[PDB]
Amino acid sequence: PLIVPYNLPLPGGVVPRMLITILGTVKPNANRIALDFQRGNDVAFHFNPRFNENNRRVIVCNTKLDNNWGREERQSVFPFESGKPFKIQVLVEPDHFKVAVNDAHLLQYNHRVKKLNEISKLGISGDIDLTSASYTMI
Numbered sequence: 001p002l003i004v005p006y007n008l009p010l011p012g013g014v015v016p017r018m019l020i021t022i023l024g025t026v027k028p029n030a031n032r033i034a035l036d037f038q039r040g041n042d043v044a045f046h047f048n049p050r051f052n053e054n055n056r057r058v059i060v061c062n063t064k065l066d067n068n069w070g071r072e073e074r075q076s077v078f079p080f081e082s083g084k085p086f087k088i089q090v091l092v093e094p095d096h097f098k099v100a101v102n103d104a105h106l107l108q109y110n111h112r113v114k115k116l117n118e119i120s121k122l123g124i125s126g127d128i129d130l131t132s133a134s135y136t137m138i
């Protein structure tokens with residue numbers, strides 16, 4: 001494969017029990033990946049693996065409101081590897097997004113943007129070959 005950056009519409013927004021699955025392969029020498037769950041121009045949930053931030057690998061999560069980034073939430077557990085296939089699962093739960101990579105729980109991100117049914121796009125960007133992006137209800 002799909003063209004990156006990729007826009008996955010989320011019709012009617014998100015809701016608890018909605019599971020998003022992204023399959024792809026990290027490029028060689030990757031620098032960054034981003035998932036952006038968007039409410040119009042706002043980013044309700046930005047999930048941003050950084051492969052080299054001051055020679056450390058970190059996942060940065062945040063929200064963008066009126067073009068302003070908020071307080072970052074950082075996770076040093078880093079399950080991505082340059083050149084390797086991955087699976088990201090984002091499960092919408094009532095009070096957070098719950099993210100697992102390669103079937104292992106990674107992090108939760110508490111809902112800052114509370115109008116879940118207005119979070120109606122997912123952008124997928126960065127240094128990946130994107131194989132598929134889809135959703136289902138569990």
Ligand SMILES: OC[C@H]1O[C@H](Sc2cccc(Br)c2)[C@H](O)[C@@H](n2cc(-c3cc(F)c(F)c(F)c3)nn2)[C@H]1O
Nearest residue numbers: 032033034048060061062069070071072125126127
């Ligand atoms: O807080 C989160 C943000 O941090 C910095 S801005 C910043 C600086 C200091 C303190 C605080 Br608070 C915020 C970022 O520049 C910002 N970002 C990343 C991408 C991006 C685009 C792509 F196309 C892509 F592929 C990708 F992977 C990422 N766009 N914007 C976002 O990550």
